[PDB]
Amino acid sequence: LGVGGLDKEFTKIFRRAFASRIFPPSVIEKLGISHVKGLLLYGPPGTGKTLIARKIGTMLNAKEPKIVNGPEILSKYVGSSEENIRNLFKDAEAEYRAKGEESSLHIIIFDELDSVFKQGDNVVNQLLAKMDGVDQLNNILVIGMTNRKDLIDSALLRPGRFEVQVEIHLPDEKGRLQIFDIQTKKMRENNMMSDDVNLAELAALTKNFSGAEIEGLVKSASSFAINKTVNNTKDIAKLKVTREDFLNALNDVTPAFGISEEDLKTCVEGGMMLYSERVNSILKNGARYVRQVRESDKSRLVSLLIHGPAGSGKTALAAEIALKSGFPFIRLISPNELSGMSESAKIAYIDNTFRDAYKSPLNILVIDSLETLVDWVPIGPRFSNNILQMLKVALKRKPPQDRRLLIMTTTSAYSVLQQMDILSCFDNEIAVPNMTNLDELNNVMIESNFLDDAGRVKVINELSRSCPNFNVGIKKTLTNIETARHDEDPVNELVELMTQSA
Amino acid sequence: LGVGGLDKEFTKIFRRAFASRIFPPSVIEKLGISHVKGLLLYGPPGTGKTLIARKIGTMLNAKEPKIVNGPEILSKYVGSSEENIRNLFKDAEAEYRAKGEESSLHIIIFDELDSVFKQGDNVVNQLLAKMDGVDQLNNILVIGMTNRKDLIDSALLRPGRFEVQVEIHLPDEKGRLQIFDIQTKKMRENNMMSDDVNLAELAALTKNFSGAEIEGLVKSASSFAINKTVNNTKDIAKLKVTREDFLNALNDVTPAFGISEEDLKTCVEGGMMLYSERVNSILKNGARYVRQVRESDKSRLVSLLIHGPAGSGKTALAAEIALKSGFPFIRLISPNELSGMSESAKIAYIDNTFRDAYKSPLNILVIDSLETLVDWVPIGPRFSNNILQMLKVALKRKPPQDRRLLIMTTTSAYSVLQQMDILSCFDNEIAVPNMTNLDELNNVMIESNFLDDAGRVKVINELSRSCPNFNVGIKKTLTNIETARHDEDPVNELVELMTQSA
Ligand SMILES: Nc1ncnc2c1ncn2[C@@H]1O[C@H](COP(=O)(O)OP(=O)(O)OP(=O)(O)O)[C@@H](O)[C@H]1O
Ligand SMILES: Nc1ncnc2c1ncn2[C@@H]1O[C@H](COP(=O)(O)OP(=O)(O)OP(=O)(O)O)[C@@H](O)[C@H]1O
Ligand SMILES: Nc1ncnc2c1ncn2[C@@H]1O[C@H](COP(=O)(O)OP(=O)(O)O)[C@@H](O)[C@H]1O
Ligand SMILES: Nc1ncnc2c1ncn2[C@@H]1O[C@H](COP(=O)(O)OP(=O)(O)O)[C@@H](O)[C@H]1O
Ligand SMILES: [Mg+2]
Ligand SMILES: [Mg+2]
């Protein structure tokens, strides 16, 4: 037919809404049943809802559907907006006067149905009165479509109105291998496709692409072969695309529900040097929870707290554990995203982020500096109570239907979180200490190629009686080393910075 | 073609948006790909985004591009505003009905697209309908332009809408040489340009000029040579522009993204004298960080705190370090800039200043009198929490894309910042102490010729017995020395003032 990967939920639509339309009225009169008049489809954008609503009508040989946009009718002035509602059905009315129950099936698509409620009452009255009032047309069938099911009021969902509802899902790996077979077909039968490409590879790499994004990949890959030979010449009738084109294109289309990789990675890491055994222990703990979530049925939600002094290195460890996990979906929430929003906008940004994490089979979330998102200042104290009560719920709600996620949160002010008592949310606590031994500083000096070994010995010797007991974080230690590299005499400056920091 | 310095952007634009229009229709119908309908260009103003749109379309010999300006739609009356969106496409429809699919390309430029969202839903919806709806045209391509990309709703950026996005940067030194080649062409071939000029020099002095400001320079340098002949004369054919005429024009034109020279030099500095050995060490240690930021790869953000008593000389040291750096971009934020603004306007002025600093290769910021920007007063205490949380984030965010900057900030209220808990933001702290020795008072008098030295002994001989332990700042000392000079008995006046001031 033309739609891939929906073979299950395709069946249910036909069974309830259309199979009754195939039989002639005389056997329907024998049963005394009455045709359903509304259907509601919901799911994430770009998944092919309209494609279903169009392709089904071809099997009935029905009229090509009318299509309407909510925001248009709502943003039009009330006058033509009002009169446009009544103008719609005249065709479905007209053939009913001419032919009645022999009349051909009519269909109307009403897009963005939630836009009416997210603030059309006349439209809702008129739209119902034509299908459920006394002026009941039997010709019509209205398809509603929305991204959010929770905004539509139950007054529309009682029987006779929108009585059947279906959910559309992102395609799994068996499905993307079908969607490639649909999109590429014309390139294959004309032999414009090389034979080194193999679609069983491309279905595995496109780990989370939706249906609409796979076209962008095919179209983008094809655009290299054209540009390779332009600049009105021969070989126009001899063009081929190559597996090289199908691997360059993966850099020009970036998926939604993907990995934010210019965050983390190049931004959050300036090193990772295993100066002490305690670092190896923490990275082994972090990697164990990542596999427990992958390989267990019994725990779909885990959340961890990472805490310690300021500048001790918490955020780089939370990112390093994530990039090695390989999960399809990763995002973070940090103060850099929320700057300049009003409080009423901040709560909507947090809420929308969690609504996305319930749509992929595996997920990670990172929350950076929880004490800063709440606006804590100790002089009052002053803080936002509305934002605190949002997070306190979101950390306990479990995702639906065997989806699962791992949450990691970091803080510098454990004494304050204990005073708000929210510590009943977390399943475990990981503590990060500062540096405290001169042997650890020797490892840092070696690993960063400070200077030749004759110099490093004197620096350790000098501190060994000037300040044997110092206590300083790794973030500051790597700064003092880097400024002394540029002075006249590093050995006599680095000691003076470290004793000031001690 | 006549556009310079934008090599890499040109390939990326041509490959995706236009190459598909060059091949014959029969081969595109063979592949089955579909033409891209929208392209988004963003960057700083005056950098040739509109220029590119005209000069690309001439290679296709397409029709002259229509132009419409966002505020010219929005500020009209709604009725004629609404009608104009329907009017704009009338030509593209009419040719399509006459030619069908073989119609020539049409192109439309939509300027200040970010004006529509910062409040347009009708005009947004109608614009989408012509490119994404049932009535979608194949003849059009729509070019969008913005400066503040983050104001675009991501609903515009999904496949099929504004699918491709490109950033235009300020030119580097390899590029500014090409712009002078283009702009001077007519002057050189008519021989109206002297042989004493050297375009490879002027490209180096125009250290941060944008393309639109080099037109202003070349025009202004020509106006001197014209005016030199008027008050209109015979022998006009003798004209030449000369190297000196560019050196005079380079004072009449001043760029954005340049030094705020007169607000640093004339206001903040009023004599710098090396009265004591502590002052040599602060300037030496301050000049080290300026070459760390210039030369090191691994550190791209640095922030310093300068703190100490009132009137000690803190603001004059911050400006003296800046004016010797030679960095291209320098600015300061001080209470004089924000006086009389509303709290909702103060936050907007601070935010916009940091987003300019992220566009140049090297930058400095001075943030003066930190406890005054917050309005802190101890009787309540009262202060603004919304401004404090604006600064606490902005001091930690690293600049994008291998750019770098140095931040310096000054305070008198170290005992208060220790309560607001913001001292984790700063990498090093510099202390500026008061005067305490009569050798320091002697050095200040010698530098400023208070009076002949046979008198100058007596001031110290009396203070040495009247009150040796005087403790005063340099700001008050220079004020006392200047008011005694105009008296009848300078010796007693200065001794009295310093004894009282202590
Ligand atoms: N083994 C390590 N553990 C932690 N950090 C390391 C290690 N090796 C190098 N680093 C570096 O130390 C710095 C730690 O910075 P980071 O921002 O994570 O500190 P932080 O404690 O989170 O700061 P804040 O408390 O202000 O959030 C980074 O530049 C990181 O590359
Ligand atoms: N070595 C020096 N260091 C600092 N200032 C000096 C020095 N020599 C002369 N001056 C002069 O002393 C004055 C110091 O004034 P300035 O406004 O910098 O004080 P301040 O510490 O900023 O005062 P406030 O604490 O109110 O900001 C300036 O006019 C400056 O030119
Ligand atoms: N499962 C699928 N199989 C084939 N094509 C698909 C599929 N999903 C999306 N598409 C393609 O993307 C478009 C259909 O999705 P569309 O209806 O535009 O998204 P939405 O449902 O958000 O309106 C068509 O161009 C269609 O060919
Ligand atoms: N890269 C460039 N090469 C040559 N001239 C340029 C360039 N960029 C800008 N100019 C000059 O600046 C003038 C105005 O630029 P404009 O296209 O209006 O910039 P924008 O549209 O981004 O404001 C142009 O007419 C042109 O002569
Ligand atoms: Mg942190
Ligand atoms: Mg000052």
Author numbering:
A (entry chain E), B (entry chain D): 239 to 357, 368 to 479, 488 to 758
Sentences from the paper on this structure:
SNARE (soluble N-ethylmaleimide-sensitive factor (NSF) attachment protein receptor) proteins drive membrane fusion at different cell compartments as their core domains zipper into a parallel four-helix bundle. The disassembly requires multiple ATP hydrolysis events in the presence of Mg2+; as few as six ATP hydrolysis events are sufficient.
To address this topological challenge, we next determined structures of the y20S complex after initiating Sec18 hydrolysis by adding Mg2+ (referred to as the ‘hydrolyzing condition’). Informed by a fluorescent protein disassembly assay, we initiated the disassembly reaction and waited 7 s before sample vitrification. The D1 ring is also flat in all these substrate-free classes, with all D1 protomers bound to ADP. In the D2 ring, all protomers are still ATP bound, consistent with their role in oligomerization. Class 2 has a well-resolved hexameric configuration with a coordinated split in class 2 in the D1 and D2 rings. This split spans ~20 Å between protomers and is large enough to accommodate a polypeptide chain entering or leaving the rings. The coordinated split in the D1 and D2 domain rings allows the processed SNARE substrate to be released from the side.
